[PDB]
Design a protein around this ligand. Structure first.
Ligand SMILES: [Zn+2]
Ligand SMILES: [Zn+2]
Lengths: 154, 70
């Protein structure tokens, strides 16, 4: 029925599950929520030294039957004050749009997201007002991001 | 968009040889096994035929280095 690319996607996710359990990226874990291999949950710790330090953030991860030839859908389920992550939890990250590659892995995705928490990209903002504040009133941006981290992510 | 079936068939193709036993197709995270067929792109990155053909049906660049295949 050629829906058998379910087999392709499931084999790849099954191997990645094993590898991300034995060798998780620093300060991240991820795994299936339940019986559906295509629907994972993930925890990210706020990178040390960043305004998100001490935060615990939850992400949803949904693989498509086309995986790994189409990117997974990854959305933040914890509120975070960050110009590339909006209140829908949409993440503005190139490798999740048209820079996706089938050689990427969910571990690589989580590492990029951690890198994005460490260094936001205000040239490609999802929350314009946060990007503008980040560039013109850096200290105000960091004060509020630390307050969000404390109230919403601990 | 990706490549025509003719452009795709014009890419290089060889059978698994014993030296490939130590290598991994980045798209399916699997070590090459005998009987496999491997495609090697101009940038010299290699994949299972079915693995990179599927990607080049709707895309035009190397999964690993992002160089244009043509
Ligand atoms: Zn392969
Ligand atoms: Zn290449």
């Amino acid at each position: 029925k050629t829906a058998a690319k379910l087999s392709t996607s499931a084999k790849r996710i099954q191997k990645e599950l094993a590898e991300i359990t034995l060798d998780p990226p620093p300060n991240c874990s991820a795994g299936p929520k339940g019986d559906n291999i295509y629907e994972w949950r993930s925890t990210i710790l706020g990178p040390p030294g960043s305004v998100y330090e001490g935060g615990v953030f939850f992400l949803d991860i949904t693989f498509s039957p086309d995986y790994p030839f189409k990117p997974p859908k990854v959305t933040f389920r914890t509120r975070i004050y960050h110009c590339n992550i909006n209140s829908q939890g949409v993440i503005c990250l190139d490798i999740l749009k048209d820079n996706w590659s089938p050689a990427l892995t969910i571990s690589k995705v989580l590492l990029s997201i951690c890198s994005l928490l460490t260094d936001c990209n205000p040239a490609d903002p999802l929350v314009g007002s946060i990007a503008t504040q980040y560039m013109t009133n850096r200290a105000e941006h960091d004060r509020m991001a630390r307050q969000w981290t404390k109230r919403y992510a601990t | 968009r990706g490549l025509t079936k003719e452009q795709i068939d014009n890419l290089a193709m060889r059978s698994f040889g014993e030296n490939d036993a130590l290598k991994t197709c980045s798209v399916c995270i699997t070590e090459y096994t005998e009987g496999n067929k491997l495609r090697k792109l101009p940038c010299s990155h290699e994949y299972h035929v079915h693995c990179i053909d599927r990607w080049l049906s709707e895309n035009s660049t190397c999964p690993i280095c992002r160089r244009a295949v043509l």
